[PDB]
């Protein structure tokens, strides 16, 4: 979204890490790679042409807090998922051990909350509550992930806790800071977040025409029964249901090929996509009144891969 502002947020994060004054932490931080900063792009979109410089800095600080929280959650998630990689490069836990990845995440969380306390109680509570739900969602995700899950309601709760509510809280917080209608943007954030994670789960099992890279097929192998698998399970005959369950947490090329044929057989890809489009439509609906081209741009683009 706006390069110069994202660049300023990137630099604020670096400054905040240096403020911790620890050569060891500087070392750990140097191994974390760039971020798309999707959340900052969404939040920055609420800024006005005439936002005063003092308020703009506060807004950049808010975006910095949100990105650091996001980074902290990813650091802990990589530990819990025993991930050795994050975007083709070695994870922090792979390079410095689980303990360091965990502490580094705590450092990101605490430094972020420290700065957050200067935002006021309304914003501080919205974001700190979002971090509480992110942690509840993470626990829910691995407990539900212990065995094949066919209860779609548990899936929806996890998506909302681990992804949707945080984006909702981030947008609501920026609206509050900029004295905008917090309800409208919280609503846009929640639905955008739901669509975003559904498409993300979709991209794990189906090709992104735009890239030649093949889908990772990382989810089911890791115990996550995402929407595609839930919708497929509801259409499979008894025999195939047995097979799908037997493939839970298994890892092989043949299982991937079988799964792709089954999704095609029951039109799961389009069915999954349509579920996300409902949320995408709701997001656009929420900001119908406003005239935010950036948000409308992002809300439409998430649905097209």
Q: Is 102 in the site for a copy of itself (CB under 8 A)?
A: yes
The two structure tokens encoding residue 7: 């660049």
What is each CA distance from 219 to 72, 198, 202, 223, in whole angstroms? Answer: 21, 12, 10, 6
Show contacts with a copy of itself in window 19-38 (CB under 8 A): 20, 22, 24-25, 28
Sign of the C-alpha dihedral computed for residues 183, 186, 192 and 194 taken in this order: negative
The one segment of 127-135, 170-178, 200-208, 256-264 that binds a copy of itself by CB under 8 A: 127-135
Nearest to 283 by CA among 197, 201, 210: 197
Q: Which long-range contacts (CB under 8 A, 24 or more apart) does 178-184 make?
A: 178/46, 178/47, 178/48, 178/51, 178/55, 178/59, 180/46, 184/286, 184/287, 184/289, 184/290
CA distance 87 to 112: 24
Residue 304 binding target from Mg ion, a copy of itself, none, CB below 5 to 8 Å by type: none
Selected binder of Mg ion within 115, 181, 200, 240 (CB under 5 A): 200
Show contacts with a copy of itself in window 54-93 (CB under 8 A): 76, 79-80
CA distance 205 to 182: 35
Q: Is 129 in the site for a copy of itself (CB under 8 A)?
A: yes
* Nearer residue to Mg ion within complex by CB, 96 or 217: 217
Q: Is 117 in the site for a copy of itself (CB under 8 A)?
A: yes
Residue 128 binding target from Mg ion, a copy of itself, none, CB below 5 to 8 Å by type: a copy of itself
Contact positions toward a copy of itself, by CB under 8 A?
20, 22, 24-25, 28, 76, 79-80, 97-100, 102-107, 109-111, 113-114, 116-118, 121, 124-125, 128-129, 131-132, 134-136, 138-140, 142-143
Contact positions toward Mg ion, by CB under 5 A?
200, 204
């Amino acid at each position: 979204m706006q390069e110069k502002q994202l660049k300023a947020i990137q630099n604020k994060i670096a400054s905040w890490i240096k403020e911790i004054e620890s050569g060891f932490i500087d070392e750990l931080f140097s191994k974390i790679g760039p971020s798309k900063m999707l959340r900052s792009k969404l939040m920055l979109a609420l800024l006005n042409e005439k936002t005063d410089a003092i308020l703009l800095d506060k807004a950049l600080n808010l975006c910095t807090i949100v990105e650091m929280i996001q980074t902290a959650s990813l650091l802990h998630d990589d530990v819990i998922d025993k991930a050795t990689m994050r975007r083709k490069l070695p994870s922090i836990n792979a390079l410095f051990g689980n303990f360091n990845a965990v502490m580094l995440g705590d450092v990101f969380y605490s430094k972020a909350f420290f700065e957050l306390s200067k935002m006021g109680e309304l914003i501080a509570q919205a974001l700190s509550n979002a971090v509480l739900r992110l942690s509840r969602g993470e626990i829910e995700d691995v407990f539900v992930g212990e065995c094949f899950n066919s209860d779609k309601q548990k899936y929806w709760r996890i998506l909302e806790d681990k992804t949707a509510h945080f984006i909702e809280a981030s947008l609501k917080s920026m609206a509050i800071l900029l004295n905008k209608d917090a309800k409208i943007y919280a609503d846009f954030g929640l639905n955008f977040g739901m669509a975003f994670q559904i498409i993300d789960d979709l991209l794990d099992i189906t090709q992104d025409a735009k890239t030649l890279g093949k889908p990772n097929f990382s989810d089911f192998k890791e115990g996550k029964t995402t929407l595609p698998y839930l919708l497929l399970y509801e259409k499979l005959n008894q025999h195939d249901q047995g097979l799908l369950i037997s493939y839970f947490k298994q890892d092989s090329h043949e299982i991937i090929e079988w799964t792709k044929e089954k999704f095609k057989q029951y039109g799961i890809i389009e069915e999954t996509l349509k579920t996300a489009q409902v949320y995408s439509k709701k997001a656009l609906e929420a900001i119908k009144g406003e005239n935010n081209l950036i948000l409308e741009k992002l809300a439409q683009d998430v649905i097209s891969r």
